Write a protein that binds this ligand. Structure first.
Ligand SMILES: O=C(Nc1nccs1)c1cccc(CN2C(=O)N(Cc3cccc(C(=O)Nc4nccs4)c3)[C@H](Cc3ccccc3)[C@H](O)[C@@H](O)[C@H]2Cc2ccccc2)c1
Lengths: 99, 99
């Protein structure tokens, strides 16, 4: 559904039986979630932001529901201050930017 | 126009006479450009992001032509890895996120 950007474009996700809200972020290549618990195996990874770079856990083939849209992707979990859905998943849910 | 998120949504801006490319960014509350010379007056501000806080300088009332459209607003200049057009300006160009 169309959102304007007068306010932060925030949605509910369900991941891992947990309900979260996350920011739809066209600038973010990758989806990055704060610390929460996920089952399984993961690889260490670093990503950059402004500020600097953080070190995250790289889980993949994770099912997320974002609004009513399912999508399976790579998720990075670590010290971001806000959960971010980025392009690897906004592409799966079909989001566009219009101006 | 309409951007699919398979590529980074980069766009051409003209600011202060200069021609830059910049990221259209729904998750970013403000616009922050890399260092460049702007005339006039500014004051120091700090912003956060993933993995830290940079100190930035704030110019208000800068004209920016973004794609083709003119908008005027505050632009923060500072050590970002990339020019980022955030919601303060995206609202002025009419951008909508649309799934
Ligand atoms: O995949 C990623 N990186 C990779 N590395 C290797 C492979 S992929 C990646 C994933 C998510 C975010 C980012 C890094 N990132 C951010 O750090 N910011 C902070 C930001 C950017 C611009 C303005 C503000 C702002 O106004 N902040 C304010 N603070 C106080 C008041 S306003 C904040 C937000 C997200 C955010 C919002 C609020 C708080 C924290 C973060 C942007 O929305 C994101 O697009 C992006 C911008 C960016 C993109 C590339 C390089 C550098 C910066 C990178």
């Amino acid at each position: 559904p169309q959102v304007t950007l007068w306010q932060r474009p925030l949605v509910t996700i369900k991941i891992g039986g947990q309900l979260k809200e996350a920011l739809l972020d066209t600038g973010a290549d990758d989806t990055v979630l704060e610390e929460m618990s996920l089952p399984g195996r993961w690889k260490p990874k670093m990503i950059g932001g402004i500020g600097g770079f953080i070190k995250v856990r790289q889980y993949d083939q994770i099912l997320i529901e974002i609004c009513g849209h399912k999508a399976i992707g790579t998720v990075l979990v670590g010290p971001t201050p806000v959960n971010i859905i980025g392009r690897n998943l906004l592409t799966q849910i079909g989001a566009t930017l219009n101006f």
